Design a protein around this ligand. Sequence first.
Ligand SMILES: COc1cc2c(Oc3ccc(NC(=O)C4(C(=O)Nc5ccc(F)cc5)CC4)cc3F)ccnc2cc1OCCCN1CCOCC1
Ligand SMILES: [Cl-]
Length: 265
Amino acid sequence: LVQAVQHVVIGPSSLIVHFNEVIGRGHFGCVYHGTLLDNDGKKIHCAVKSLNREVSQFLTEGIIMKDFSHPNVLSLLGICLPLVVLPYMKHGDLRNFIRNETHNPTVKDLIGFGLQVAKGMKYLASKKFVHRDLAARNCMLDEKFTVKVADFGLAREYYSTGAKLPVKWMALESLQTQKFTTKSDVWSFGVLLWELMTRGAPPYPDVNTFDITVYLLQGRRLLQPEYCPDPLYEVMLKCWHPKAEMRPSFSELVSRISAIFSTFI
Ligand SMILES: COc1cc2c(Oc3ccc(NC(=O)C4(C(=O)Nc5ccc(F)cc5)CC4)cc3F)ccnc2cc1OCCCN1CCOCC1
Ligand SMILES: [Cl-]
C-alpha cells in the first residue's frame, strides 16, 4: 500500500487546494478545485478529493486507480499526505451532462458516450477488475468530451449486512447473493445505456428500491427509450439476461455498439 502511495506521492509544496471552492460535498468526502504544479512550474487544474474527518479505505480507492491507464477510465494524478488528486473533468458526471435541457446531443452522440464506457469497461474486464457501481452518475466527461469511467467512492436516493446498494442498477444474481462479477457489470452497463437514451431519466420510477428483485422475476425489464434504436434495445435486453453466462461480454459490447453507432451520419 504505502510502497505504492510513495510511487504516486505528490509534495504539499506542489499542490494548492482552493478550500474556498467546493465542487461538491457528501458525509464521508469533499471535492475541491485545485492547482497542481509540475517541475517546470506550470499549473494543472485538478480536483482535490478529501475526507471530512476508514483512512486506509480512502487510500486503497486511490491506489487501485494507479494501475488504470486507459482514455475511458479516470486517472489518478497523485496522493498528497490526505488528498487524492484527479484530472479535472470540465463537464462533470455524465448523468448531469445529459440531464441538462439546454444540451442537445444527437442519438449518435449518446451512443458514442455508451461506446466509450463499453471501451473503458473492456479494458477493466481485461484487468480482472469488477466496478460494482456502474451508472451514468459515476462516469466523468472531460473538455474533449471523453467519457472517463470512475467511482465517486466515499464522496458518493439511488442507493439503499451494512450494504449501501444501487439496487436499480443491479443484476438478479447480485441482488439475491450480494456477489458481483464482470457479467454483473454488464447488467449495470445495460442500465447505463437506458439512462443515456432517456437522457438521465430515473430507472424504474414507479418501482420501489427493495421491491426491484420481485419486479424483475415477474419478467419485467425497462421499456425501450424513445431515442433508442431497435438494435440498441436488443443489446440492452442481452445485458439483462437472467443467467450471467448468456450476457454479452464487454468485448462483444464494443463490437455491436460500434456497428450501431457507425450507421449514423
Ligand atoms: C461533481 O462535479 C465534479 C466532480 C469532479 C470529480 O469528482 C470525482 C470523481 C471521481 C472520483 N473518484 C475517485 O476518487 C475513485 C475512482 O474513481 N476510482 C475508480 C474506480 C473504477 C474505475 F473504473 C475508475 C476509477 C475512488 C477512487 C473522485 C472525484 F473527486 C473529479 C474531477 N473533476 C470533477 C469535476 C466536477 O464538476 C466540474 C464542474 C461542472 N460544473 C459545470 C456546470 O455548472 C456546475 C457544474
Ligand atoms: Cl426492438
